[PDB]
Design a binder for this molecule. Structure first.
Ligand SMILES: [Mg+2]
Length: 446
């Protein structure tokens, strides 16, 4: 294989990557230089009948539940197609905001449909990357040559549509994917060394090399959690590694007020200028001098304050033990991805479910230990393969739907639609989508 990039993007029916359902996936493969080498891959996911989309999401995407249902395949087949693209060897799977959103959608789709939620991103020399934190890093650290738009609040905006507009990039189903490729080419051209640096440091071992806990060696870190008001940037120092999470290091934000850290106990601590950096999540980290004096000035970052805090922290190493202590501590199976890793035996069993013909599942005679699996398998069969359900199973599914579609939920859904149709009365496209959402809800739930 040669190294490739797979740019992708989901449209979904709501904001929650587990509890809302996907609507559409789009992707295209490029070579290592961002030349398109594949065909556009665009397809839909039929939503199961235990779900109503968030009206807000449909207003954004323009994709109705009727359209995804008519054009889509079941989530099992949707998952299969995405897994086949993602597991091509030597693929860097990337998008725009995928680390915090799309990748969580992928993990949950794989989880619900009996794929490994994690292996795709690293096996066969694969990786992931995310152009959102690349753009944020450019603004903070190397803003030359790119136009940086402000939003209506007066803050720098990193919405993809704003950055393409501001930089002369033309921006159907493939719009977002092609815009993301355009942004990658933009940074590679205008900030070549930073682009190379950020690409190389997507690798967790390269990130590890930057981390010197004994010395509390300061680093620049660009993170959306720091806020657009300071260009999402600060100087941080590593205090300790997370006592449970092998991939998380506990950083102190040196720009913060460290008083609570010094003069408060770990229980009270559990603002507090502590954050986890997850080395498997493409965090932006670099040597402290990567943030140049002019840019620190521009972003309002106070170097002396950071250095004074760093000095205090180094002179008080008992703070390390303190922060380690901080981190030393629903019944919906769809929400339970992070309730733990499955055992080896359970993954083996789940693989048999995956590789068994849907018509043969009712007679499958395997054993699971993890308590999530019985429910995962029932939902998987009832959502994807409802013609294979026996009478008792149909009754179970009917009860499931009744438990989702509570009186409070249905009333609130009707209320939201009626509110939105008044609010958007002058937008004829939106009014039409809302009427479609009402009609779908009438069919599914009333
Ligand atoms: Mg997106």
């Amino acid at each position: 294989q040669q190294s490739t990039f797979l740019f992708h993007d989901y449209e979904t029916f709501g904001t929650h990557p587990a509890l809302d359902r996907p609507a559409q996936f789009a992707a295209i493969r490029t070579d290592s230089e961002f030349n398109v080498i594949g065909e556009p891959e665009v397809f839909y996911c039929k939503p199961a009948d235990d779900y109503l989309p968030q009206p807000g999401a449909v207003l954004i995407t323009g994709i109705t539940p009727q359209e995804a249902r008519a054009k889509g395949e079941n989530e099992a087949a949707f998952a299969a197609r995405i897994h086949s693209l993602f597991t091509v060897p030597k693929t860097c799977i990337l998008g725009y905001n995928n680390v915090r959103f799309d990748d969580e959608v992928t993990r949950n789709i794989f989880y619900r449909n009996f794929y490994d939620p994690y292996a795709w991103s690293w096996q066969h020399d694969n990786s992931r990357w995310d152009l959102l934190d690349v753009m944020r890093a450019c603004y903070a650290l190397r803003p030359e040559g790119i136009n940086w738009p402000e939003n209506d609040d007066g803050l720098p905006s990193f919405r993809l549509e704003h950055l393409t507009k501001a930089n002369g990039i033309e921006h159907d189903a493939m719009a977002d994917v092609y815009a993301t490729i355009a942004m990658a080419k933009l940074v590679k051209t205008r900030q070549p060394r930073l682009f190379d640096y950020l690409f190389t440091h997507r690798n967790k071992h390269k990130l590890m090399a930057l981390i010197d806990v004994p010395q509390m060696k300061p680093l620049v870190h660009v993170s959306g959690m720091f806020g657009a008001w300071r260009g999402n940037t600060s100087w941080v120092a590593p205090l300790a590694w997370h006592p449970e999470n092998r991939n998380a290091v506990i950083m102190v934000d040196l720009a913060g007020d460290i008083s609570p850290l010094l003069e408060l106990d770990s229980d009270t601590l559990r603002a507090v200028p502590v954050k986890l950096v997850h080395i498997n999540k493409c965090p932006v980290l670099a040597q402290a001098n990567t943030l140049r004096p002019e840019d620190a000035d521009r972003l309002g970052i106070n170097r002396q304050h950071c250095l004074d805090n760093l000095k205090i922290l180094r002179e008080n190493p008992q703070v390390r033990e303190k922060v380690v202590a901080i981190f030393a501590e629903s019944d919906n199976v769809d929400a339970q991805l992070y309730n733990g890793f499955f055992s080896d035996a359970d993954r083996a069993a789940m693989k048999i479910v995956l590789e068994t013909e849907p018509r043969n599942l009712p007679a499958l005679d395997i054993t699971f230990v993890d308590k999530r699996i019985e429910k995962l398998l029932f939902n998987y069969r009832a959502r994807n393969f409802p013609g294979t359900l026996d009478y008792a199973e149909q009754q179970r599914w009917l009860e499931h739907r009744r438990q989702v579609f509570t009186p409070e939920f249905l009333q609130g859904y009707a209320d939201e639609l009626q509110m939105l149709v008044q609010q958007y009365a002058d937008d004829k496209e939106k009014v039409a989508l809302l009427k479609a959402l009402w009609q779908y809800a009438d069919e599914i739930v009333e």
